[PDB]
Symmetry: C3
Subunit: 337 residues, 3 copies
């Protein structure tokens, strides 16, 4: 609370990892409050988002879409050093939905190419929160170009269920969902531009339709399927953090459920249970806990099946272990009528 | 647990009924776990969804859109014999969101025309869940062709409110909301086809716009009105189950309320109370308990009034009873200004 | 119960104020149950919804979009004298979501131009509820023309958190969010019509797209900005009631949080806490309680950033007070890299 106390707190640098993987942390806080330091360089680059070679001039924190997940405990201070290289052509900033004041920090971190800034904030509330770039006048554009992520502020004493009973996960994954608005020419072919700003006008026209051309996980159609599927084993407890900085989503683990789901993302708000499909509004993050019971492949999707299977909002989970015939059994395999 | 133990469980064959009605069942489980058997034949047929003669090539479970509601209690086993007659042209399967393993069953139930299969799963979680067809690579198409429904896994001891008091209903209705995407020719007239597959290409383009041409209850505009209006009486406690396998909905009982609403559809997640309009994400089912206090006709709708009154999402309830002037009264009937 | 017992109740006529302000009231009920009287005259008037001059023929209760907020206590009787002037061309009625019977009151208040009516209903359920016009056959047209508002039925003992601790706000604002569907000409310019009737056909075509041309607060793009910006101070407890009679919204106070959010708008439903972005389904109202901690400008928006910053759903908050460096601080201001 006092100047003396804050300045005396321990400083601790963390090495970030690209989604859907998460950096090192302890569910239960180790030691007292500390100033957790992170650093992210902003990269403006063209990325291919589908099998048709469709490009997007990405604006990515730490070079990834979405930005990496930052994990701190309640009442710690998140001190982030944001850098916008001279090679970039736009001004960026950052808004932490977890922070209080200055529009989430957006007003204190507006950096042009060739600048860096250091913002500190006390994570006073526990939950998963979205963070995103918000330069005044072109907020949506930056956000829908991939410039968003989320952070997890864990209660000092780890997660718990509705009746105070502790919930300890074995694995944690971060799925950032992105709605893209790529322009098409009169023939229907997606367009490519030299610089980010060149697409500005055409993109906004697409944005106003409120109909994304692609809705993806980890920046691309299929980014989390195939060999890039997330893993687990029967018996394993998994926390799947999910975010959507600009548009609603309805997550669903096909084959499983969300045993405990902090749908609003706030840990002080009791988790719903036995969820089939949960809902996360635009501009929020949510977290679902589940203990795998059956092996095989699972499909984790946005349950608007058109957005999942036509637009690209589908990921996989490869689970190992033994099958349970009490849970499910093929009494009579598909056979002649 | 052991196959031996399950084999010794009493089995019961249940007779399914067309929505909005629900087959006979007991709120409080009568006895120990049983293996509840059901049989549904898949019927591919043309359905007329509006008074303009618009046709949809439905892929209907048990012949109706939505498929019938199956009722079992927690920890019972639901055994379904799914049949895909040789009269059909497509492979179909079934995913129960209430089940655990093999993508909810779809992976163990892929039956081509002229095949059948039998699936058994333990209803481990109490609540209303969605079920739907989901052929690999043709998922949304089958779902938006009306191939979906719901099941209700009641708690053994029946329904209860957040504080444990028993909530016993007098009537139950199942309302399945469907979002259709019907192609139109260059003149804005809805197109008709001679075969399901002939409309595939045309339908996928409409689906991608994420804008349904129709949003209807029980398969057609006006389906649940007039001869198909739901009934009740002042003093009657009614449970309205609602499902939407592909798209969000916001149910509303015009003139009444949602006394208790399990918005997520999961009974272990306490119900919201005194609701005016509840929300159900695409891919889930919710349930609302309400005791009618006033006679007259009510209108149950998706409260995006455009969807409800332009697109077709509206149903009626004809309630009998005595008017309660304490609740509402016309002090001055419409008259001179 | 009896008309004699209701007539023996004290009556109090209330003078309404234009949104975002609310007429005077007490959080805790002043004594016992009373019949609270209100009067509103319907005005069909042209309004301008943006800086380019886009006009809409609105259907406004009390001449405002949204209609004013009426405030009463649970078990009070709300007696509304609704007047439809001779200068109006259409018939109108009102559906109170807080009421029980005759389609929320709509069936008993159908008045033509030149008529008036007086409806009384008991405010039996505590919470915020929208009210809107619903002429049979033209329900959505009236609503998306601005003919909706909201009411608040406070618990007779004022607000409390989910654990019983009292929640008393210092100020209260009412944000009515409106989705408009404005036709455009062949050049993309918004169209103007002589009579509201002349706008119907073209407007219906846009409504069916389910993509509004404007999403605004208090009737217009930027209505709640500049000298019309809401105000507060550090330490000030603010209750923000938000409604959307026809379309979903997801409120977010950029730079702040929703400390206690009755997202379903029903006070008997415990509030969520520490919310970053909440959700209010079309056809409902919600309420958020927040104690300001930092000074400066805040943007209160619907967090689908395209809706917020392209469609018009952004309001501002001007907050006085001392900056809190503990909560947030610029360790290094934007500077050389
Ligand atoms: Cu940026
Ligand atoms: Cu934001
Ligand atoms: Cu099928
Ligand atoms: Cu599914
Ligand atoms: Cu009207
Ligand atoms: Cu309504």
């Amino acid at each position: 609370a006092t100047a003396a106390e804050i300045a005396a707190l321990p400083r601790q640098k963390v090495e970030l990892v690209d989604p859907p993987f998460v950096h090192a942390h302890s569910q239960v806080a180790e030691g007292g409050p500390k100033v957790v330091e992170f650093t992210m360089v902003i990269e403006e680059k063209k990325i291919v988002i589908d099998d048709a070679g469709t490009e997007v001039h990405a604006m990515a924190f730490n070079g990834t879409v979405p930005g990496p997940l930052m994990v701190v405990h309640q009442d710690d201070y998140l001190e982030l050093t944001l850098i916008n290289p001279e090679t970039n052509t736009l001004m960026h900033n950052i808004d932490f939905h977890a922070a209080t004041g200055a529009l989430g920090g957006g007003g204190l971190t507006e950096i042009n190419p060739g600048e860096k800034t250091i913002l500190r904030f006390k994570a006073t509330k526990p939950g998963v929160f979205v963070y995103h770039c918000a330069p005044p006048g072109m907020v949506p554009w930056h956000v829908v170009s991939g410039m968003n992520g989320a952070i997890m502020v864990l209660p000092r004493e780890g997660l718990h269920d509705g009746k105070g009973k502790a919930l300890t996960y074995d694995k944690i994954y971060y799925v950032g969902e992105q709605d893209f608005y790529v322009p098409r020419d009169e023939n229907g072919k997606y367009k490519k531009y030299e610089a980010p700003g060149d697409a500005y006008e055409d993109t906004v026209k697409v944005m106003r339709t409120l109909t994304p051309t692609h809705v993806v996980f980890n920046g691309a159609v299929g980014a989390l399927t195939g060999d890039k599927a997330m893993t687990a084993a029967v018996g394993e407890k998994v926390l799947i953090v999910h975010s959507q900085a600009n548009r609603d989503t309805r997550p669903h683990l096909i084959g499983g459920h969300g045993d405990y789901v902090w749908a609003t993302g706030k840990f002080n708000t009791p988790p719903d249970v036995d969820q089939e499909t949960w809902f996360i509004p635009g501009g929020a993050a949510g977290a679902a806990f589940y203990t795998f019971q059956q092996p095989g492949i699972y499909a984790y999707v946005n349950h608007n099946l058109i957005e999942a299977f036509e637009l690209g909002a589908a990921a996989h989970f490869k689970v190992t272990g033994e099958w349970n015939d009490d849970l499910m059994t093929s009494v009579l395999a598909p056979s002649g009528t």
